[PDB]
Design a protein around this ligand. Structure first.
Ligand SMILES: *[C@@H]1O[C@H](CO)[C@@H](O)[C@H](O)[C@H]1NC(C)=O
Ligand SMILES: *[C@@H]1O[C@H](CO)[C@@H](O)[C@H](O)[C@H]1NC(C)=O
Ligand SMILES: *[C@@H]1O[C@H](CO)[C@@H](O)[C@H](O)[C@H]1NC(C)=O
Length: 119
C-alpha cells in the first residue's frame, strides 16, 4: 500500500477521527486499513473512539475498519442506505479480508472539531 493511493475523506476531524479510503476501485482490508492510518501518522481508531466522535456529531455513510477487528458506521440521522436506517455507531462483523474504508484517530487533536478553535 502506497500513501499516494489514499483519500482523506474528512478534513475537519471530530474528536480526532477521520475517514480514509482508497482512490481505486478496491478498498482496504483490515491489515491495509491499519497501514493506511500508519502511513498518515495516525492509528486505526477503536469503536469507542468513533462513539466519542459521534457524540460530537461525526457522521459517515461508509463502513470502515476499527482496531477492534470489525467495521462500523457512524450515524446521526436514519438513512436506509447507511447502516440500515439506524443511528449510533453500528457494528458489522466481516472477514478481515473484506475491503472497506478506515477510521483513523489523531491523538494530537485537542479540539472537538479540528477546524474550530476551542478553549
Ligand atoms: C467542523 O467544522 C467545519 C468547519 O466549519 C464544519 O463545516 C463542520 O460541519 C464541523 N463539523 C462538526 C461535526 O461540527
Ligand atoms: C490484505 O491485503 C493485502 C494486500 O495489500 C494482502 O497481502 C493481505 O494478505 C490481505 N489480508 C487478508 C486477511 O486477506
Ligand atoms: C493531528 O492534528 C494536528 C492538529 O491538531 C496536526 O497538526 C497533525 O498533523 C495531525 N496528525 C498528524 C500525524 O499529522
Amino acid at each position: 500500500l502506497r500513501a499516494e493511493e489514499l483519500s482523506i475523506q474528512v478534513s475537519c476531524r471530530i474528536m480526532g477521527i477521520t475517514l480514509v479510503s482508497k482512490k481505486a476501485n478496491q478498498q482496504l482490508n483490515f491489515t491495509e486499513a491499519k497501514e493506511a492510518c500508519r502511513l498518515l501518522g495516525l492509528s486505526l481508531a477503536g469503536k469507542d473512539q468513533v462513539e466519542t466522535a459521534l457524540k460530537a456529531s461525526f457522521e459517515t455513510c461508509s463502513y470502515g475498519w476499527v482496531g477492534d477487528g470489525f467495521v462500523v458506521i457512524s450515524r446521526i440521522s436514519p438513512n436506509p442506505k447507511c447502516g440500515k436506517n439506524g443511528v449510533g455507531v453500528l457494528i458489522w462483523k466481516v472477514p478481515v479480508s473484506r475491503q472497506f474504508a478506515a477510521y483513523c484517530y489523531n491523538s494530537s487533536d485537542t479540539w472537538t472539531n479540528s477546524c474550530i478553535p476551542e478553549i
